[PDB]
Amino acid sequence: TDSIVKASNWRLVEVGRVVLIKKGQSAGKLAAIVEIIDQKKVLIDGPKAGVPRQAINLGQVVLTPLTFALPRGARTATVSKKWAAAAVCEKWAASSWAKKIAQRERRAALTDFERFQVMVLRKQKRYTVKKALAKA
Amino acid sequence: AHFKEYQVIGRRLPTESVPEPKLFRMRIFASNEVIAKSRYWYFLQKLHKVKKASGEIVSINQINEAHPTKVKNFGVWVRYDSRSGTHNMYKEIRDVSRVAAVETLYQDMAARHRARFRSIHILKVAEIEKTADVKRQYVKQFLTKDLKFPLPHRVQKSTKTFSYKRPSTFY
Amino acid sequence: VEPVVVIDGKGHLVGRLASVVAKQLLNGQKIVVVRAEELNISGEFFRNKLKYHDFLRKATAFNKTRGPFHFRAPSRIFYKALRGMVSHKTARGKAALERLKVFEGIPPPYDKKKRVVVPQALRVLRLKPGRKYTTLGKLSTSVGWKYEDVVAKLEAKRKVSSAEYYAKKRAFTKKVASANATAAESDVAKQLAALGY
Amino acid sequence: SHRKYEAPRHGHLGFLPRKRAASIRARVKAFPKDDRSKPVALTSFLGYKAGMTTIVRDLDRPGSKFHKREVVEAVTVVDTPPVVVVGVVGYVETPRG
Amino acid sequence: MKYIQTEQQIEVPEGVTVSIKSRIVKVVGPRGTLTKNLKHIDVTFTKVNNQLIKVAVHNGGRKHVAALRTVKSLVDNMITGVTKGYKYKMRYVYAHFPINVNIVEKDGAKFIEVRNFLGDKKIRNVPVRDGVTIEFSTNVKDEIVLSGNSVEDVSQNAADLQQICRVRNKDIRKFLDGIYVSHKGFITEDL
Amino acid sequence: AESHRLYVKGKHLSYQRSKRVNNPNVSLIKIEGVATPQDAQFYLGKRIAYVYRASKEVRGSKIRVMWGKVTRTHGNSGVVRATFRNNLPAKTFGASVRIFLYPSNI
RNA sequence: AACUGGCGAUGCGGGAUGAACCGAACGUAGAGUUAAGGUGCCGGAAUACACGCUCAUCAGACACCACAAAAGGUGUUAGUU
RNA sequence: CAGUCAAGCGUUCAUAGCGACAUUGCUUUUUGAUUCUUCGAUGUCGGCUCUUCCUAUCAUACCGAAGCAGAAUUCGGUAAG
RNA sequence: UUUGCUCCACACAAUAUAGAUGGAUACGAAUAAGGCGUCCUUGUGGCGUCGCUGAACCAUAGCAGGCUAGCAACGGUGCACUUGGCGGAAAGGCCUUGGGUGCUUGCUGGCGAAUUGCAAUGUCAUUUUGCGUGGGGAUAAAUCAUUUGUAUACGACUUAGA
């Protein structure tokens, strides 16, 4: 019988790793780790998502599962071309993390009338769901 | 605060016997123009026979980094005074700009030798981009081919005092 | 915000938790702290035992019954830290210390209610990996607390009952999901999703 | 300055306060540690101290100079009529005792 | 200085399997199964092809990269014990009083009994760890063999005998009496 | 239905004070849900009521009110400064005040 | 005993406490801003941000000031041939 | 009272035990130096009595080291029970 | 000894709430790891997915929530009852078994609201009782004085006395 070990792989930081900056001017935009300065600093670029090419602490950014092939220290135009070719933006949008962010934005965006509409529809769905519970 | 780099050119005060003195230049890492001029006069007093009263400053200019968004290696030769003597040290660091390089060099000197700003002379900052010129292993370590590492044990900051589920440090 | 906040003391650094809870009690929040025997203190167990022995050495010379009362239970140790963090000799401090309640394990009123954590006090988040720590129950039994085993037994029984309750709750939630998946993906659900819910 | 000559303290500090007991009847503070294997049994009895008298008995310790020699010993007599069992109480263990 | 990545390779023979949960290592092989907790080490594991496992520390100090190779050697020890086993041979050194060693069972626990150590009336009792087998080896006078899988328990039982046989109130440079480990090897060596 | 609350909840923390002297003319108010001065800037100028009850009827009610107003922010953590027509009675350190939504600007 | 500044003769904020230190000197009030000192809780104010160093079986913790030395240590960190 | 360095002593051998010439220190159980408190008074030497505390440990517990064969010693550690 | 003492309500009547104004919303555990779902070798695994904060979840529309008419629906839910229990750490809480009653905003109608005047908390929840009312219950001790001496300065303390 074979030996088993728990793989325990977690979101390496490397050239091409897509990050979601959480604080600062960008604060919610996607960037690519273009180079690793240090254990705590990497050079990132966000030409598609609106992040200027800048050095940043990894404390400011959040590593995302997305990664695309990108040469180390590639310029903004090349990072841009490779980002487009790999189609990382729509892949990010498809994720439930980005879906969670967009859902939270929409919920904060509702108005009072839309909150009343949400109440009405939620009461309806609750009635039908508990009816299905009773009948099933 | 944020260090800037200034080119400071100054001369001895021209006399009738000797018009147009030799007009020496330095590169000074300093917080602002006032401290840049003060450090220029400090070092000029250290090298040649001239002081602020006996000379004048003909130019002060911010030297912006040529490519401030590229990663290069920096060799910094410094001279600093300990509690017992004067020592020259050489350290190698990684940054995008020379000014931030010198800023974190000052932080490093304060942290590892308790050397304050006053007791440090930045002898030289040289940019090297070719490996096998880097000598420090703590820079050669990040100079690795196709380097990649994880960040285990992620601690997420909470704005609310109370959390309702036990935290996870996965990353 | 809440009538009472109940804090799972497990994994919490005693000082950070005491500071948080003292600020809350002075701000007017009722707080119950459970699992005090699972509170942590940074540093080696021998070190904190030496600290408690230094505490024990202090007593009023001419009458030891007037001196500092060195309480031994983990809940009482946490309470002593918090009373040190509160201005306890004024009526406001007495009101805050009345607002506080702390227990070993989880008594019957609170084993059936929600328990929260304070992430700015949790050891797993605060202490650097590889730093030694002690457990309040282990220190307390080392210095004279007599109920490490009674509390452990009652904790095992309570955890067994709570795990059975959780299995039942999972089953009910899963069956609700299975039965209402048929009613899911409906027009009302689509409208709610468009609205953001 | 120090005590000129060292002597032990007068009395035992562990029998304090040297005050009156709360009752004549001295309750058993601690009972023998329980073990489930042995049969059920009482661990105490109640008697009345009647007085002291003397006994003569042969002493048997192999190595004393009074071995197998008679010794005169003081004894205390406790009159112990059989006690009536009227009731029982059960104690649940709690984190407070 | 926070070495970014230090990793070592633990080799796995063709007959043994290592099952490693979070930090609970279990090595199974021809001789038996050995379990070790490593929750105090803060290390990571990655199996390569079932014949090698890489043990790694990311961003560790000197005192962390030391513990990395320490746990690699501990896993070496467990694998070696499960494959070949450990055999500790100890001799009896006595000038006048011969050491009398026996194996006794008070409530079935296989205590080792030492008598007449420097001719005293005290009997020195030492328990045997689980998985440690005691054998009074023949063909050599005053030799005892301690065999097992866990080198930790085998060596600790040998140390227990050696420690219980200390000489007191005498010059131990002259009174060389005692049971000393003379051989540390393998049960199935040269097989 | 069961909720009629038309105000935000808050706590009266203390008076404006240094280490060793307090100023009863200014009260520190924490607004529940607010943890930054940026978010507390919404409540600047909003009216506040400390509502309490007495055992004696005054003018047809056993409930008395002390009105006040959020004047500015206090610190980096969403606490604000408030001023009341009568200083809060200092037994209410940690008591509930009602931060109304008027005078409204939304 | 020195060019001085203070206490005495002087409260106030800070140094926990203190005649002299730091800040600043005083009519009775109200807003704002600060000094010195501080912002985990006591306690008003960031369990702020950033880079390091340190783990002590007597850690350390901010001047006056309420103390420690010579000599040592493959503890750990950074520096020439 | 305790360290640091070792020229030497210890038949050889600086450091088992010592240790010169130097030098760094530790609460004040000495005695000085000072004159801040008390001269509209803080009852003084010693002893007796009694409690407690310190440790720089004489003994007792357990150890390390010897120029520790055994006994007897000597040098140190945790130790004031 | 005028109606005593003991388990709920009311024309009525304290120092007052250290301070409700929709909900204190229940798994061990680990964190260099886990939560959930599924699969297959009587096997401590494979596979998929999630997290990146509670900004959540549940509750929430009606005179502080009135009076009323219908529509596929047997649901959801507040209450006088009945049936299993479970819970001793400080259990004082959780469903159900069934009968009765009231709302239902799940989807559609009809009437009412002003005038508190342009806001004023605009009054809605609690360790006690009483000449009082009713669904029901039994008529105890302590102490002083006497005595005692296993106690004792005095108090207290072991005792006794229809």
UniProtKB/Swiss-Prot annotation, chain C:
GO biological process, one term: cytoplasmic translation
Database matches in PROSITE patterns: RIBOSOMAL_L13 (PS00783)
Location in the cell: Cytoplasm
Pfam families (alphabetical): Ribosomal_L13
A GO cellular component annotation in the UniProt record: cytosolic large ribosomal subunit
Cross-link (Glycyl lysine isopeptide (Lys-Gly) (interchain with G-Cter in ubiquitin)): K175
Molecular function terms from GO: mRNA binding; RNA binding; structural constituent of ribosome
Maturation and modification: N-terminally acetylated by acetyltransferase NatA.
Alphabetic keyword roster: Acetylation, Cytoplasm, Isopeptide bond, Ribonucleoprotein, Ribosomal protein, Ubl conjugation
Protein's UniProt keywords contain Transport: no
Gene3D superfamilies for the chain: 1.20.5.4280, Ribosomal protein L13 (3.90.1180.10)
Role of this protein: Component of the ribosome, a large ribonucleoprotein complex responsible for the synthesis of proteins in the cell. The small ribosomal subunit (SSU) binds messenger RNAs (mRNAs) and translates the encoded message by selecting cognate aminoacyl-transfer RNA (tRNA) molecules. The large subunit (LSU) contains the ribosomal catalytic site termed the peptidyl transferase center (PTC), which catalyzes the formation of peptide bonds, thereby polymerizing the amino acids delivered by tRNAs into a polypeptide chain.
Subunit structure and binding partners: Component of the large ribosomal subunit (LSU). Mature yeast ribosomes consist of a small (40S) and a large (60S) subunit. The 40S small subunit contains 1 molecule of ribosomal RNA (18S rRNA) and 33 different proteins (encoded by 57 genes). The large 60S subunit contains 3 rRNA molecules (25S, 5.8S and 5S rRNA) and 46 different proteins (encoded by 81 genes).
From Swiss-Prot, chain D:
Crosslink site: Glycyl lysine isopeptide (Lys-Gly) (interchain with G-Cter in ubiquitin): K38
Modified residues (Phosphoserine): S23
Superkingdom in the source lineage: Eukaryota
Leader sequence segment: none
Subcellular location: Cytoplasm
Gene disruption: observed consequences: A mutant confers resistance to trichodermin, a trichotecene toxin produced by plant-pathogenic fungi.
Homology family: Belongs to the universal ribosomal protein uL3 family.
Assembly, per entry: Component of the large ribosomal subunit (LSU). Mature yeast ribosomes consist of a small (40S) and a large (60S) subunit. The 40S small subunit contains 1 molecule of ribosomal RNA (18S rRNA) and 33 different proteins (encoded by 57 genes). The large 60S subunit contains 3 rRNA molecules (25S, 5.8S and 5S rRNA) and 46 different proteins (encoded by 81 genes). uL3 forms together with ES39L one of the contact sites for the signal recognition particle that targets ribosomes to the endoplasmic reticulum membrane.
Miscellaneous notes: Present with 450 molecules/cell in log phase SD medium.
Name assigned to this protein: Large ribosomal subunit protein uL3
Covered residues, full protein: 2 to 98 of 387
Swiss-Prot record, chain E:
Pfam families in the record: Ribosomal_L6
Annotated GO CC locations: cytosol; cytosolic large ribosomal subunit
Keyword terms of this UniProt record: Cytoplasm, Ribonucleoprotein, Ribosomal protein
Places the protein is found: Cytoplasm
GO molecular function per UniProt: rRNA binding; structural constituent of ribosome
Keyword Transferase in annotation: no
Gene Ontology annotations of biological process type: cytoplasmic translation
Annotated family: Belongs to the universal ribosomal protein uL6 family.
Protein's UniProt name: Large ribosomal subunit protein uL6A
Organism: Saccharomyces cerevisiae (strain ATCC 204508 / S288c) (Baker's yeast)
Swiss-Prot record, chain F:
PROSITE patterns documented for this protein: RIBOSOMAL_L35AE
Covalent cross-link (Glycyl lysine isopeptide (Lys-Gly) (interchain with G-Cter in ubiquitin)), residues: K46
Post-translational modification: N-terminally acetylated by acetyltransferase NatA.
Job description of the protein: Component of the ribosome, a large ribonucleoprotein complex responsible for the synthesis of proteins in the cell. The small ribosomal subunit (SSU) binds messenger RNAs (mRNAs) and translates the encoded message by selecting cognate aminoacyl-transfer RNA (tRNA) molecules. The large subunit (LSU) contains the ribosomal catalytic site termed the peptidyl transferase center (PTC), which catalyzes the formation of peptide bonds, thereby polymerizing the amino acids delivered by tRNAs into a polypeptide chain.
Keyword Oxidoreductase: no
Keywords, sorted A to Z: Acetylation, Cytoplasm, Isopeptide bond, Ribonucleoprotein, Ribosomal protein, Ubl conjugation
Pfam family membership, one: Ribosomal_L35Ae
N-acetylalanine sites (modified residues): A1
Sequence similarity: Belongs to the eukaryotic ribosomal protein eL33 family.
Subunit relationships: Component of the large ribosomal subunit (LSU). Mature yeast ribosomes consist of a small (40S) and a large (60S) subunit. The 40S small subunit contains 1 molecule of ribosomal RNA (18S rRNA) and 33 different proteins (encoded by 57 genes). The large 60S subunit contains 3 rRNA molecules (25S, 5.8S and 5S rRNA) and 46 different proteins (encoded by 81 genes).
Gene Ontology cellular-component terms listed: cytosol; cytosolic large ribosomal subunit
PANTHER family recorded: 60S RIBOSOMAL PROTEIN L35A
Protein name stated in the entry: Large ribosomal subunit protein eL33A
Domain of life: Eukaryota
Gene, per the UniProt record: RPL33A
Subcellular location field: Cytoplasm
